[PDB]
Write a protein that binds this ligand. Structure first.
Ligand code: CLA
Ligand code: CLA
Ligand code: CLA
Ligand code: CLA
Ligand code: CLA
Ligand code: CLA
Ligand SMILES: CCCCCCCCCCCCCCCCCC(=O)OC[C@H](CO[C@@H]1O[C@H](CO)[C@H](O)[C@H](O)[C@H]1O)OC(=O)CCCCCCCCCCCCCCCCC
Ligand SMILES: CCCCCCCCCCCCCCCCCC(=O)O[C@@H](COC(=O)CCCCCCCCCCCCCCC)COP(=O)(O)OC[C@H](O)CO
Ligand SMILES: CC1=C[C@H](O)CC(C)(C)[C@H]1/C=C/C(C)=C/C=C/C(C)=C/C=C/C=C(C)/C=C/C=C(C)/C=C/C1=C(C)C[C@H](O)CC1(C)C
Ligand SMILES: CC1=C(/C=C/C(C)=C/C=C/C(C)=C/C=C/C=C(C)/C=C/C=C(C)/C=C/C2=C(C)CCCC2(C)C)C(C)(C)CCC1
Ligand SMILES: CC1=C(/C=C/C(C)=C/C=C/C(C)=C/C=C/C=C(C)/C=C/C=C(C)/C=C/C2=C(C)CCCC2(C)C)C(C)(C)CCC1
Ligand code: SF4
Ligand code: SF4
Lengths: 97, 733, 153, 193, 82, 42, 81
């Protein structure tokens, strides 16, 4: 196939799914899941390196789509695209049935 | 404290000699020390880990340096067969001249020891070819040891001392270790295989000089970024390929073809590169799971809280278990040791059946030593896992924070678990011993046909399900019309089936009724050792005889002769009893392995198939028959190179028998003897001038149990190691 | 031919083992006159060996490559008499013994000094309860159904 | 009641549509769990209702069966066919991509609603003929939907089991085999080979 | 009582060494067979003088060598001893 | 006679009688049905 | 630097714990929590050897006298030399 077209299409579809379809569920799950030790969060327990970067996660997007979500969903898209490319290149693998 | 040991005020003021003993066995138990806090304990653990890494690196560097300086690696590379590896030279002033004669092996000019650790094959496979490479590797490992020591010193200084909450940041640590320590390291090893080891196997010398000039593929990184990854699997090495030379070589980098290399009888290097690349991908993916400072990810606390089955069949589920597993170091240590022992047994069972290094399948003594070593290591590590679980139960378990958990419910129904383990062990022992005694009696009476020989139909069916065709089962991977066979037909099935169906390697050996009996004995040993360890862990906090055992610590001698007698009532004593059963189980496993392989290598598997079904066959055809050259290491007529193994054999027998007195004879007799000895020294002229500073006392009960167990284990290991190496070196196969 | 095992009545090695046994027995027999008691004992032993080998051949046993019969416990209906039928018989007898012992322990449970009925067995009650284990599966199944088999403490 | 002469479980009172008091394992003790089970059961039955003609009709029209229609994706470079005509864009990556794109965001809006009745029976644009306006006929149609859907689930179990018993053939072929001579070819032959 | 229990093992050890000494010495230097010519051939060939001075000699030429008659007794009249 | 029967009902004497009867039964069965490896009656 | 001998309130008042002591560690003091109007006490635990004869004679369900082994001296190790 054409690597550029497949990679762009898969990354765009993954970012679309993350921004529109699976955004509210993900946001609710990160709201419910916060790492805590002994009943308190990692940073307030005394760990200076466990502070959450509120500047990096602040975004001007209307829904709150920040750079970390872009990186994660782009990773999903790139992985899916490379899986598609490597499988389509190989004219084998569970084909004899 | 004002006296050794300085970490214990109670031991420092002891006027007896046990202080000198007890300052040794309590030195690394920081939690029992004086005036310790949590953060100091964690920092001491960190520094000791850095030290342990330094000693590991130094030991590896010493191995490389001694092989480079006194070994014959360069001459072993040219002729991997018909050349014995050399570990290090021998300089013994007590040596006689025939000892110098008999120990001059290889191309060496003096006495040398023959390396049985397999480091030669491992270094030859991964690209090392000359002694300067070994010198450079030893220097690099020494530098790594110095770096680890410097880091351990640095991270203890008040400026760089980590906080306790930093150690309890489990999510970030697990994410980094899964992605970086596992994924990135496997990716780097893939890079080493692709850039150096695989071209080295094809006759190309790739070092740091030609590192940036030699292309691993003719097409470069283009097939990596533009899709079409299969261009890295175009032409693999041929069946007529010779290792280390360009004859029959290929240009493929990542392939999935099963089986072994035809010449080295080991797995393909390209297979290993693809395996480590896939493992790197999987671990790098898995290292982005848990939450960190970036907002996304999972919280393992809420992961444990959420998994509660409705209906209350598990109580409160895993509620509050994160706090207990994070706050307790012994919980983490027990889980780490359990997993490490399981994968160490996996390493042992997978290296002999699927050898990983060139020309290591032909080296039988190396394979036997490696298997026995790693299996004993795994047994000891599993015993330690259970012991540290018992330690956690005594020390770190909080019943108020663990109410109705999946952990408290173990203590709720501990009687059922212990009784069912007892039933399983008793049933296995009863029936296995009965079948063995039945076979021995039947063959003693001249009627071998009346034996009870049960074919392991289940495991044979499993072997047929993996592709073996020596049993006639037409099942998956053995029938040509199955969907499992048809799906993987074109990728790896021909090589895998060729390796499996070949009856010369250790891949899926043919098994019979003796294998059935010895596997059931193995199950008996595993179940009994688990019974002892689980009983100790679950009765560590108390029982009906001693309801307040938790107040007496992990290791205490007894609770007096009251209530009928309370010897060996602590969980430490349960560990001490279970060490014997672990040693017996590993002895059975390694006996089975060594006898099956020493009958296969001779091409005389009928001897094992006909003699392993009764215990007299084990005693005669394995222990008595294979020890002739071992005990003939030195005789009145002279000596040979097996004299060291005979001496170590007798040494192991002696030190195995010496622990019997720390285990049978007990303290009061020796104390009453020491009293008379002290009187004799105090009343002997010219000897009252010399007086002791520490009052001589007998060995403590727990101390004597540990000393006897240590002598017992040393005797076990040294005796079996001497017998194994002498049997497989007097005849190689 | 399960698991690559030839039947014992069509195995050359089985007949070979019988030949070695008979040859050794004849070598022992040659030392005595045929009308003597040791000769008669040896002849009886040889006849017993021949009957044993014939029975093992005719029973349907599968003989391995070493000439010895191999039992199959996988549940194959051709070899249900090697493990499954003797296993059922053993389970019946063991349940009989266990049920009789449990019934005796229950019967002497509510006495003034029950231990005196354990060191010294009260024979009439034991002989009365001996045959109660003949129908042990039915009694055990009903007791489990009525919740009398287990004790809730 | 599903089983006459048997007491009803305490969780079920018969008020629900299709509430015949069948819960031997007691899965629906928790009321919100029971509501989730009602929604999941309704979705399963509706999917099987869409399934059953979608399996029978292509077999009746001579286009293969419901297992032939998935063979093309197994073949390398397979081409899908509709009504005997090959769809130009009918390849496995494109079909899977459009299925993931459109099956999501239609299963996502279904999870946005929080009303349990609207989660089961949304109405609005999904009820254009006004069959839910009258309440008595609404409950009657609820019961009819429940019963036909349970029948469809049983039919799909029959589909899977008959495909496992007779590999690579259609359910109507099995029906014709039964109708050829019913006293000889049926479940009995596979239940006792 | 525990002193008696400990001394039982040591009496066992002493008597075991004594009977091993007796067995090997009479098998090597006393017991044997007389030929018609007049020569004497012992059971173990008089190896007590050179082998019994080492523990390896006791392990090999006495235990290992003479245990072949008890481990190979299966199938014969001495199988009860095995 | 009652005391002697009580002595016969004690644990070792009763165990000896029971196990001797069982051993005799097993020995006679092994004489009349020798060399039994399978259950061929069915 | 001595074995820790502790008395709990479940003590009946039997003096067997005191009579069984070979080093005169325990004694009987007045009390009001039992019929015997007395309880055991351990004021001389510095001479305790740890023989646990005292808790081998305690008749309660579990021991009202408990000896926890601890730091050992010349008189706690039973050394006459
Ligand atoms: C993975 C590494 C590992 C680590 C870090 C620990 C860590 C610890 N263990 Mg565990 N343990 C392990 C594996 C490990 N264990 C294994 C494999 C076993 C089975 C053999 C055990 C069995 C065990 C026992 C039986 C005990 C501990 C205890 C302890 C403490 C050490 C005691 C000491 O001061 O040294 C003592 C050792 C020496 C310095 C020398 C004496 C014995 C040597 C090894 C002779 C043999 C030669 C420390 C908390 C002790 C503790 O008190 O826990 C509360 C204790 O009682 N461990
Ligand atoms: C990505 C960067 C990173 C890396 C590389 C590491 C790496 C390490 N950390 Mg971790 N750590 C990290 C992030 C990281 N950490 C962070 C962010 C935190 C804070 C939250 C911590 C907190 C932390 C603590 C508190 C401690 C460590 C420890 C360690 C060391 C473990 C001991 C060992 O060497 O394992 C070696 C293991 C492997 C390389 C892989 C696993 C081996 C598998 C199980 C076996 C299979 C492999 C294969 C078959 C091998 C073949 C062998 C060959 C001969 C053929 C290791 C150096 C310990 C320490 O520092 O000791 C000095 C420790 O005490 N870490
Ligand atoms: C090699 C000899 C040996 C043998 C046979 C046993 C046997 C046993 N061990 Mg012991 N053990 C040994 C050495 C041995 N141990 C050593 C050296 C140690 C280290 C101190 C231990 C420590 C130990 C621990 C810590 C535990 C055991 C337990 C067990 C039981 C395991 C389950 C099972 O196999 O039962 C099968 C039974 C047998 C093999 C023994 C009976 C032999 C036959 C069947 C007798 C039948 C009687 C016969 C008719 C003779 C008549 C007697 C008389 C009239 C002449 C079993 C009783 C575990 C347990 O209790 O499980 C319930 C357990 O918790 N053992
Ligand atoms: C009266 C019959 C009797 C019965 C029904 C049971 C029942 C049970 N036993 Mg117990 N047991 C008995 C006697 C009995 N036991 C005796 C005499 C002993 C001392 C050796 C034990 C010691 C024992 C152990 C060590 C274990 C059990 C276990 C078990 C359970 C599993 C079965 C099994 O492991 O058997 C194994 C049985 C024995 C080891 C052999 C002894 C049984 C003899 C053959 C029969 C006793 C019958 C009696 C003397 C006859 C009197 C008749 C009356 C008319 C006077 C099961 C609840 C296991 C467990 O708890 O797991 C749940 C287990 O670990 N039992
Ligand atoms: C429940 C959802 C559903 C699904 C997933 C399918 C799926 C499928 N149908 Mg079926 N079908 C359905 C319901 C469904 N059908 C219904 C309700 C009817 C009646 C109108 C049909 C009548 C038809 C026809 C198909 C065909 C097909 C296949 C080709 C699809 C295409 O677009 O080209 C595809 C496997 C084709 C086929 O038979 O495959 C060869 C064909 O031409 N279907
Ligand atoms: C692990 C358990 C075990 C098992 C399952 C067996 C199994 C067997 N043994 Mg072996 N055996 C064992 C241990 C065991 N043995 C041990 C420890 C020894 C040494 C003491 C022997 C020594 C031995 C001898 C010396 C002999 C056997 C024989 C037998 C066979 C049955 C005997 C018989 O004819 O019964 C017949 C049937 C019964 C007695 C059933 C009685 C049921 C009563 C009547 C009730 C009927 C119900 C109403 C069978 C293959 C015999 C043989 O020939 O083997 C091929 C035989 O001669 N065994
Ligand atoms: C010679 C061998 C016979 C030895 C037994 C006969 C003398 C023993 C005493 C005796 O019979 O006293 C006579 C005793 C009891 O006879 C009287 O009984 C009275 C009860 O009403 C009182 O106990 C009397 O004191 C008691 O003497 O009879 C027995 O209990 C004997 C039972 C049968 C003994 C069988 C002998 C065979 C086994 C021998 C071992
Ligand atoms: C195999 C699967 C076995 C499943 C067992 C788990 C089911 C619950 C076990 C409860 C039990 O043992 O007792 C029940 C009875 O046992 C059963 O119902 C299970 C029988 C198991 C054997 C049959 C299983 C199928 C075998 C097919 C062949 C009911 O008794 P109860 O608790 O109501 O009794 C109370 C008493 O009257 C006092 O108030
Ligand atoms: C809601 C709404 C809304 C708006 O407002 C309006 C409207 C639109 C109107 C509406 C809608 C509607 C609809 C769509 C409907 C549909 C239906 C269906 C499809 C059903 C099925 C249904 C279905 C069903 C019952 C099914 C059944 C089945 C069966 C019997 C089967 C049988 C069989 C056969 C023969 C043969 C083989 O061998 C076997 C089997 C396979 C077993
Ligand atoms: C501004 C904005 C916009 C735009 C946006 C965009 C356009 C974006 C893009 C984005 C992107 C574009 C992203 C990406 C990402 C990616 C990443 C982050 C990565 C991934 C990857 C990875 C992670 C890896 C990979 C690999 C390799 C390395 C090789 C081997 C294989 C693999 C695949 C594994 C709009 C207009 C809408 C609106 C307004 C605003
Ligand atoms: C005391 C204690 C403790 C400890 C414990 C231990 C030490 C344990 C061990 C454990 C163990 C040592 C375990 C093991 C396990 C194993 C498993 C779980 C396995 C699995 C497997 C599988 C799942 C497989 C599968 C398969 C097959 C069959 C083949 C083919 C492929 C596949 C993969 C599919 C702790 C600290 C925790 C806590 C406290 C208490
Ligand atoms: S401590 Fe023991 S002996 Fe003393 S009064 Fe209490 S129960 Fe009696
Ligand atoms: S342990 Fe011995 S010395 Fe100490 S209080 Fe008890 S009886 Fe007295």
């Amino acid at each position: 196939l054409s690597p550029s077209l497949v990679i762009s299409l898969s990354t765009g579809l993954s970012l679309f799914l993350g921004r529109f379809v699976f955004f509210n569920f993900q946001r609710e799950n990160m709201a419910k899941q916060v790492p805590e030790q002994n009943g308190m969060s990692h940073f307030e327990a005394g760990d200076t390196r466990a502070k959450e970067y509120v500047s990096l996660l602040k975004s001007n997007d209307p829904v709150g789509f920040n750079i970390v979500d872009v990186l994660a969903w782009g990773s999903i898209g790139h992985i899916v695209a490379y899986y598609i490319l490597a499988t389509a290149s190989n004219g084998y693998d569970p084909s004899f049935f | 404290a004002l006296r050794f040991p300085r970490f214990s005020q109670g031991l420092a003021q002891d006027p007896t000699t046990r202080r000198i003993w007890f300052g040794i066995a309590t030195a690394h138990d920081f939690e029992s020390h004086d005036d310790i806090t949590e953060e100091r304990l964690y920092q001491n653990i960190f520094a000791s880990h850095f030290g342990q890494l330094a000693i590991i690196f130094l030991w590896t560097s010493g191995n490389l340096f001694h092989v480079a300086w006194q070994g014959n690696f360069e001459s072993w590379v040219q002729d991997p067969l018909h050349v014995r590896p050399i570990a290090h030279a021998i300089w013994d002033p007590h040596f006689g001249q025939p000892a110098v004669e008999a120990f001059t092996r290889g191309g060496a000019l003096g006495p040398v020891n023959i390396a049985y650790s397999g480091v030669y094959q491992w270094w030859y496979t991964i690209g090392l070819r000359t002694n300067e490479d070994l010198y450079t590797g030893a220097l690099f490992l020494l530098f790594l040891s110095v770096i680890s020591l410097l880091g351990g010193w640095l991270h203890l200084q008040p400026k760089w001392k980590p906080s306790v909450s930093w150690f309890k940041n489990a999510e970030s640590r697990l994410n980094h270790h899964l992605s970086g320590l596992f994924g990135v390291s496997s990716l780097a090893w893939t890079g080493h295989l692709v850039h150096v080891a695989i071209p080295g196997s094809r006759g190309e010398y790739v070092r740091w000089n030609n590192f940036l000039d030699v292309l691993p593929h003719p097409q470069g990184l283009g097939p990596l970024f533009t899709g079409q990854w299969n261009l890295y699997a175009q032409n693999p090495d041929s069946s007529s390929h010779l290792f280390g030379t360009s004859q029959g070589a290929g240009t493929a980098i990542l392939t999935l073809l099963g089986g072994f290399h035809p010449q080295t009888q080991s797995l393909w290097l390209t297979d290993m590169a693809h395996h480590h690349l896939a493992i790197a991908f999987v671990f790098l993916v898995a290292g982005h799971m848990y939450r960190t400072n970036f907002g996304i990810g999972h919280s393992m606390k809420d992961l444990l809280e959420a998994h509660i089955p409705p209906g209350g069949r598990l109580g409160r589920g895993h509620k509050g278990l994160y706090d207990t597993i994070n706050n307790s170091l012994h919980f983490q240590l027990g889980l780490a040791l359990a997993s490490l022992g399981v994968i160490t047994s996996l390493v042992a069972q997978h290296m002999y059946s699927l050898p990983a290094y060139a020309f290591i399948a032909q080296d039988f003594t190396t394979q036997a030593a490696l298997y026995t070593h790693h299996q004993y290591i795994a047994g000891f590590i599993m015993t330690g896992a259970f012991a540290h679980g018992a330690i956690f139960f005594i020390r770190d378990y909080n019943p108020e924070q663990n109410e109705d958990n999946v952990l408290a419910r173990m203590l709720d129904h501990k009687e059922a678990i212990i009784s069912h383990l007892s039933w399983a062990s008793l049933f296995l022992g009863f029936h296995t011993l009965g079948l063995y005694v039945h076979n021995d009696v039947m063959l003693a009476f001249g009627t071998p046909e009346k034996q009870i020989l049960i074919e392991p139909i289940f495991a044979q069916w499993i072997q047929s399900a993996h592709g073996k065709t020596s049993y006639g089962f037409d099942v998956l991977l053995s029938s040509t019309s199955g969907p499992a066979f048809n799906a993987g037909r074109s990728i790896w099935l021909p090589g895998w089936l060729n390796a499996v169906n070949e009856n010369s390697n250790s891949l899926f050996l043919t098994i019979g009724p003796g294998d059935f009996l010895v596997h059931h004995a193995i199950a008996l040993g595993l179940h009994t050792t688990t019974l002892i360890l689980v009983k100790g862990a679950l009765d560590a906090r108390g029982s009906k005889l001693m309801p307040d055992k938790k107040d007496f610590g992990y290791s205490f001698p007894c609770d007096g002769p009251g209530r009928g007698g309370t010897c060996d009532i602590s969980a430490w004593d349960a560990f001490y009893l279970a060490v014997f059963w672990m040693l017996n189980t590993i002895g059975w496993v390694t006996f089975y392995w060594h006898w099956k392989h020493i009958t296969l290598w001779q091409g005389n598997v009928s001897q094992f198939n006909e003699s392993s079904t009764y215990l007299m066959g084990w005693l005669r055809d394995y222990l008595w028959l294979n020890s002739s050259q071992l005990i003939n290491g030195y005789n009145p007529f002279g000596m040979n190179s097996l004299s060291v193994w005979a001496w170590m054999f007798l040494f192991g027998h002696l030190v195995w028998a010496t622990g019997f007195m720390f285990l049978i004879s007990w303290r009061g007799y020796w104390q009453e003897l020491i009293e008379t000895l002290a009187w004799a020294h105090e009343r002997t002229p010219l000897a009252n001038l010399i007086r002791w500073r520490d009052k001589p006392v007998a060995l403590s009960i727990v101390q004597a149990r540990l000393v006897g167990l240590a002598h017992f284990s040393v005797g076990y290991i040294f005796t079996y190691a001497a017998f194994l190496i002498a049997s497989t070196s007097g005849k190689f196969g | 031919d399960i698991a690559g095992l030839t039947p014992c009545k069509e195995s050359k090695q089985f007949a070979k083992r019988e030949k070695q046994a008979l040859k050794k027995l004849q070598a022992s027999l040659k030392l005595y006159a045929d009308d003597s008691a040791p000769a008669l004992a040896i002849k009886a032993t040889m006849e017993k060996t021949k009957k044993r080998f014939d029975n093992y051949g005719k029973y349907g046993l599968l003989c391995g490559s070493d000439g010895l019969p191999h039992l199959i416990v996988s549940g194959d209906q051709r070899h249900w008499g090697e493990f499954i039928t003797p296993g059922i018989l053993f389970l019946y007898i063991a349940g009989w013994i266990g049920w009789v012992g449990r019934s005796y322990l229950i019967a002497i449970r509510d006495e003034k000094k029950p231990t005196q009925k354990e060191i010294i067995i009260d024979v009439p009650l034991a002989s009365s309860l001996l045959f109660r284990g003949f129908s042990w599966p039915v009694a055990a199944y009903r007791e489990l159904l009525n919740g009398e088999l287990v004790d809730n403490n | 009641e599903w089983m006459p002469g048997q007491p009803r479980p305490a969780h079920l009172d018969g008020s629900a549509p299709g509430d015949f008091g069948f819960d031997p394992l007691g899965l629906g003790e928790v009321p919100e769990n029971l509501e989730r089970f009602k929604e999941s059961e309704l979705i399963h039955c509706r999917w099987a209702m869409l399934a059953v003609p979608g399996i029978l009709v292509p077999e009746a029209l001579g286009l293969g069966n419901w297992v032939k229609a998935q063979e093309w994706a197994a073949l390398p470079g397979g081409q899908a066919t509709y009504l005997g005509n090959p769809v130009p864009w009918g390849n496995l990556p494109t079909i899977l991509a459009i299925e993931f794109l459109a099956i999501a965001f239609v299963e996502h809006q279904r999870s946005m609603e929080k009303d349990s009745e609207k989660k089961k029976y949304p109405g609005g644009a999904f009820d254009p003929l006004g069959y839910s306006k009258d309440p008595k006929k609404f409950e009657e149609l609820k019961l009819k939907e429940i019963k036909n859907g349970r029948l469809a689930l049983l039919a799909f179990v029959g589909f899977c089991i008959q495909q496992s018993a007779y590999p690579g053939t259609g359910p109507l072929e099995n029906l014709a085999t039964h109708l050829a001579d019913p006293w000889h070819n049926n479940i009995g032959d596979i239940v006792i080979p | 009582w525990d002193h008696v229990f400990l001394g039982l093992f040591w009496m066992y050890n002493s008597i075991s060494v004594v009977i091993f000494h007796f067995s090997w010495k009479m098998q090597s230097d006393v017991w044997g067979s007389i030929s018609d010519q007049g020569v004497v051939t012992h059971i173990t060939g008089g190896n007590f003088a050179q082998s019994s001075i080492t523990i390896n000699g006791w392990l090999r030429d006495f235990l290992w060598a003479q245990a072949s008659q008890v481990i190979q007794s299966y199938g014969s009249s001495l199988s009860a001893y095995g | 006679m009652r005391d002697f029967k009580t002595y016969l009902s004690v644990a070792p004497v009763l165990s000896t009688l029971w196990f001797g009867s069982l051993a005799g039964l097993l020995i006679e069965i092994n004489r009349f049905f020798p060399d039994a490896l399978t259950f061929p009656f069915f | 630097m001595s074995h820790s001998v502790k008395i709990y309130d479940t003590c009946i008042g039997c003096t067997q714990c005191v009579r069984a002591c070979p080093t005169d560690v325990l004694e009987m003091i007045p009390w009001d929590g039992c019929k015997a109007k007395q309880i055991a006490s351990a004021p001389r635990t510095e001479d305790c050897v740890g023989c646990k004869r005292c808790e081998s004679a305690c008749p309660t369900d579990f021991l009202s006298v408990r000896v926890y082994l601890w730091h050992e001296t010349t008189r706690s190790m039973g050394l006459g030399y």
